[PDB]
Amino acid sequence: MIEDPYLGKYVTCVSARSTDKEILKKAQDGGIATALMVYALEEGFIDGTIVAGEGDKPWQPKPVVAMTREDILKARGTRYNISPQISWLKEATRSFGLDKVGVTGVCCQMQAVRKAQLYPINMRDVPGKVAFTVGLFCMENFSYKSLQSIVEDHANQSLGSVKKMEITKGKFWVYTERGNVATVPLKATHKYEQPGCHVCLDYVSNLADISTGSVGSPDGWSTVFIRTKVGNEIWSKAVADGMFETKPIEEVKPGLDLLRKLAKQKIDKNQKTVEERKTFGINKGLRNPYA
């Protein structure tokens, strides 16, 4: 068990991509989040999972309890605006009748699940029915109006034409279905970020069973942390079953060196913000949820 001060607690870290070519056709990166949930369903580690499905406006996610391989695949690809994944957490155990709930989401959503497991506050039956969590890396998120403003104004693209969006190499990238590419400098996006992201002290989904993301791995690949006993059992079985190609992370460039550095910048910048809240006023401060 490595206990990293910026990458959290984990057993191993590899670079990986799914061997399911259908999944990879529309996965954001390696298809880890989709492949892990499909496999968990077909093997019976879960009987349903919360995923960011398609919503009612283009590129606006809608949380949904998926119970088939087909419904899980609809959630492929990154939506860079808020998806309130945890709103279906209790309901998954009520009208859906699930015994083994999967949850996907970003770092704060992993935190929400773990708080619910230890301090269930009107969350009956949830502690014991959470079966598997896959956490995405997340530097920051946006309101939907923020995302519209970035894509339509700054990138000058129509949302109905966008095939993929990607934050990497210092730019917000927009790919269209007809084959065009537009970029926006990340400096331009800063005003649009969701303010509650600025106290977040968690980059690589420290509290998930398995965490997955893009940084540290070449395109089409994911950096994966296997963290908990649940996470290790499922990953071992999946690898043994042929579900994934892997490479130890230290044989991969830029790997864990860059990743640990981006995690450190996030925590340091946001810890400072948390500190300034304390003296925000005159002889008064703002609340610290971590106090």
Binding site: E152, N156, T176
Partner: peptide, 16 residues
């Protein structure tokens, strides 16, 4: 559907 996307892409460019 492809033509509708193409007209939107071109109009976005044209507007600027």
């Amino acid at each position: 559907p492809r033509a509708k996307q193409k007209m939107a892409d071109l109009a976005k460019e044209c507007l600027v």
